[PDB]
Design a protein around this nucleic acid. Structure first.
Ligand code: MG
Ligand code: MG
Ligand code: MG
Ligand code: MG
Ligand code: MG
Ligand code: MG
Ligand code: MG
Ligand code: MG
Ligand code: MG
Ligand code: MG
Ligand code: MG
Ligand code: MG
Ligand code: MG
Ligand code: MG
Ligand code: MG
Ligand code: MG
Ligand code: MG
Ligand code: MG
Ligand code: MG
Ligand code: MG
Ligand code: MG
Lengths: 116, 151, 70
RNA sequence: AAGGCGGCCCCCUGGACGAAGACUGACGCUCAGGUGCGAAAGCGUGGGGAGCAAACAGGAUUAGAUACCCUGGUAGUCCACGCCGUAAACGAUGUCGACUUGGAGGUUGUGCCCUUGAGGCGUGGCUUCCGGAGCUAACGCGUUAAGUCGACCGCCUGGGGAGUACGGCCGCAAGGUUAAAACUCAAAUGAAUUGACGGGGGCCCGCACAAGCGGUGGAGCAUGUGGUUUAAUUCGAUGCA
């Protein structure tokens, strides 16, 4: 519905999982899909290929909106940081730009302890 | 072999048909080290399979292998608490030998009378794309795509 | 690390340009070093060894660039 | 000066160094008792509390796990004013002067040429690394000495008992400082060497793993051993070996 012509793709990668959310420039979600949500529960949801499977799933189920242009905003340096956007173009999108947004503080809050 | 590269000694192509591939079949099937019983069982079983369905005695038996060859197989590497299998391709030389073994081990599990009869039935199913041989090939294929994220 | 895909070209080269941006701008490494908090002593100690062994490599080079080996 | 000090701006303030000269003219060095500053944790009275997080609770691993791991979480960490006065407060190296071959650097001034444009020639102040004589138990230090010397101060006299007990002084408290004895042992210790070992690191091996085939442990029997019985059940071999 509303046949949105161009959209945005947020990749929220992490050391444990990957979430793909497709939006528009207004910041309103259309569909989401995660590696853990794609049946890869366990230690396999952090694999780079596990992000490949999820990216196609979110590329699908937004075909109702007829999205033809995507802007990729990668976040959260982790395993699924570049593979998950190889699958985005394989779904037929015409990526206009790729931007890396990620929280880099200027020495803000104190991080947790070292692990032992 | 830590430091050894091997070359397998050649074997005699079989007299009846001249296929060295079939000569391996009698070697795999042979038990307790004797070829007189094993060779005749293979030859006799091939007659029934050829008579039952299609000509080209060798080609009917070659169709079965074309259906049971596995194109991928997992191997395990231990890292932490538990080992996880990693898929890897199968070299064509070992690919022939793997399905060549699976048919015989599956044949010895039928309830028929003669080992020749059990071998003929199993080869019939494999050529018809059915039976225990392709089922064994199906598991290694399914369990290699089950965890393909590893490499 | 903003990249603007040029007139067509291949997406792989655009991806390879985006990867080079993160490598050159140090986006990947800063997240790892700031994931946990290490004490100020450990920061001072690690920089001590890092500079000492860097200079020791230079001082150990002069003992092999002129001495015949075989 | 040490503890320590890290966005930018403002206004109060201390110290260091360099060039060229004037000026006072021994005004100097060290310092028992004193006096001041002194990380973090901790204490008191007010505030503030985002994030981390002693204590605490739950989930796991475990034979137990009052721990490491996971999800939460209060004092505290922050501010103002007072206490506390201890640290591996460590270049384990007191302060102040003099002299004694060298290299490669870092940082901050300067006075000459070639303001030829980079540069070249030197002199100053801090500071990093390597090494000569020499030093010594050896490691190592080596003009910023652990070298050759002068002037003051502090400290040491086998290991435990013990920086503990009692008694003073200090503190709101925690505790700090000064500081023994009986008894007990023939050692305690520093450096370096040869091995052995490591859930330290390399490189190379082999039926060591991997790829396969056939077995043992399940049954009946043969044979040896342990045990138990017996008048005796002769003696020896006992992880691999
Ligand atoms: Mg964590
Ligand atoms: Mg005094
Ligand atoms: Mg404090
Ligand atoms: Mg308080
Ligand atoms: Mg309070
Ligand atoms: Mg915790
Ligand atoms: Mg002390
Ligand atoms: Mg104490
Ligand atoms: Mg200190
Ligand atoms: Mg220090
Ligand atoms: Mg001391
Ligand atoms: Mg003094
Ligand atoms: Mg030296
Ligand atoms: Mg005391
Ligand atoms: Mg006392
Ligand atoms: Mg094996
Ligand atoms: Mg048995
Ligand atoms: Mg004897
Ligand atoms: Mg005996
Ligand atoms: Mg004996
Ligand atoms: Mg004996």
């Amino acid at each position: 519905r509303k046949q949105v012509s161009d959209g945005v793709a947020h990749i929220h990668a992490s050391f444990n999982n990957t979430i793909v959310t497709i939006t528009d420039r207004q910041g309103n979600a259309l569909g989401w899909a995660t590696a853990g949500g794609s049946g890869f529960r366990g230690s396999r949801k952090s694999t780079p290929f596990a992000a490949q499977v999820a990216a196609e799933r979110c590329a699908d189920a937004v075909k109702e909106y007829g999205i033809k242009n995507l802007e990729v905003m990668v976040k959260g340096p982790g395993p699924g940081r570049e593979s998950t956007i190889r699958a985005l173009n394989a779904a037929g999108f015409r990526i206009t730009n790729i931007t890396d947004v990620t929280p880099i503080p200027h020495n803000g809050c104190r991080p947790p302890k070292k692990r032992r | 072999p830590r430091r050894r590269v091997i070359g397998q000694r050649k074997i005699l192509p079989d007299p009846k048909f001249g296929s060295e591939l079939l000569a391996k079949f009698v070697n795999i099937l042979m038990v307790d080290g004797k070829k007189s019983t094993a060779e005749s069982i293979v030859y006799s079983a091939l007659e029934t399979l050829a008579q039952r369905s299609g000509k080209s005695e060798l080609e009917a038996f070659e169709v079965a292998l074309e259906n049971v060859r596995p194109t991928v197989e997992v191997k395990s590497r231990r890292v932490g608490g538990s080992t996880y299998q990693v898929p890897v391709e199968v070299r064509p030389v070992r690919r022939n030998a793997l399905a060549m073994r699976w048919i015989v081990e599956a044949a010895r599990k039928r309830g028929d009378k003669s080992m020749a009869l059990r071998l003929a039935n199993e080869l019939s199913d494999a050529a018809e794309n059915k039976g225990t041989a392709v089922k064994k090939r199906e598991d290694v294929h399914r369990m290699a795509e089950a965890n393909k994220a590893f490499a | 690390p903003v990249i603007k895909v040029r007139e067509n070209e291949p997406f792989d080269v655009a991806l390879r340009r985006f990867k080079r941006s993160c490598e050159k701008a140090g986006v990947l490494a800063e997240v790892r070093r700031r994931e946990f908090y290490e004490k100020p002593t450990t920061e001072r100690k690690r920089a001590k060894a890092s500079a000492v062994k860097r200079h020791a490599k230079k001082l150990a080079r002069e003992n092999a660039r002129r001495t015949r080996l075989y």
